[PDB]
């Protein structure tokens, strides 16, 4: 882990939080709980492992429930798409330029499946996270990621990482086991590549 300065605690009150908050939603699937955000009208992107093979997925926009359906799931992909009809909040926009080391960012999500919380963060490093090719295992072998300094929790899974402009830099998908205050974020390029696999293979039963 590359060491960086502690995140600016003032980031919780930054207008960027209130601007993106309505579009960041809590997800409950049937016991399993996570975070998502609006990517396009009536469509929510979330963590695939949270909603994996679930027929009872609910989306909470502003403490109010909306029925969701997993319409895009691929076992080889970290992200999933939920279809959420009549969902008021507008889509969030992805940042077009990659984030740099030391930049102050914010993780938005629902840690422990509670209320919406903004977690102050700082970019450690942009890296290619490559593992071994596990035989018979579908999950990705390589990932474009940001390592971040942040007190991240499994409830933040599927939560967007947002810059000071209000744009999504990536999506929280993990943390370090031995290192506290260390989170792993899929880059906007990585999410695009993963959504591309789904866009290419659809429709699938």
Curated annotation (Swiss-Prot):
GO terms for cellular component: extracellular region; peptidoglycan-based cell wall; plasma membrane. It comes from Mycobacterium tuberculosis (strain ATCC 25618 / H37Rv). Its EC number is 3.4.21.-. It is an enzyme of class 3 (hydrolase). Residues 13-198 form the Peptidase S1 domain. Inhibited by reducing agents and activated during exposure to oxidative stress. GO terms for biological process: proteolysis; response to acidic pH; symbiont-mediated evasion of host immune response; toxin biosynthetic process. Keywords: Autocatalytic cleavage, Disulfide bond, Hydrolase, Membrane, Protease, Transmembrane, Transmembrane helix. The active site is at residues 49, 78, 157. It is found in: Membrane. It comes from the Bacteria. It is a multi-pass membrane protein. This is Serine protease Rv3671c. Autocleaved. The autocleavage activity is significant only when no reducing agent is present in buffers. Required for M.tuberculosis resistance to oxidative stress in addition to its role in resistance to acid, which is essential for virulence. It protects M.tuberculosis against phagolysosomal concentrations of acid and maintains its intrabacterial pH when phagocytosed by IFN-gamma-activated macrophages. Its main location: membrane.
């Amino acid at each position: 882990v590359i060491p960086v300065a502690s995140p600016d605690p003032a980031l919780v009150n930054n207008p960027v939080v209130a601007a993106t908050e309505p579009s960041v939603v809590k997800i409950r699937s049937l016991v399993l709980e996570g975070t998502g955000f609006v990517i396009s009208p009536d469509r929510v992107m979330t963590n695939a492992h949270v909603v994996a093979g679930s027929n009872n997925v609910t989306v909470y926009a502003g403490d109010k429930p909306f029925e969701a359906t997993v319409v895009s799931y691929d076992p080889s992909v970290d992200v999933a798409i939920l279809a959420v009809p009549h969902l008021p909040p507008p889509p969030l926009v992805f940042a077009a330029e990659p984030a740099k080391t030391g930049a102050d960012v914010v993780v938005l999500g629902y840690p422990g499946g509670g209320n919406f919380t903004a977690t102050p963060a700082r970019i450690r490093e942009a890296i290619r996270l490559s593992g071994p090719d596990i035989y018979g295992d579908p999950e990705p072998v390589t990932r474009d990621v940001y390592t971040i300094r942040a007190d991240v929790e499994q409830g933040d899974a599927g939560g967007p990482l947002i810059d000071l402009n209000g744009q999504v830099l990536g999506v929280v998908f993990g943390a370090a086991i031995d290192d506290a205050e260390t989170g792993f974020v899929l880059t906007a390029g990585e999410v695009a590549g993963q959504l591309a696999k789904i866009g290419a293979t659809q429709p699938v039963g």
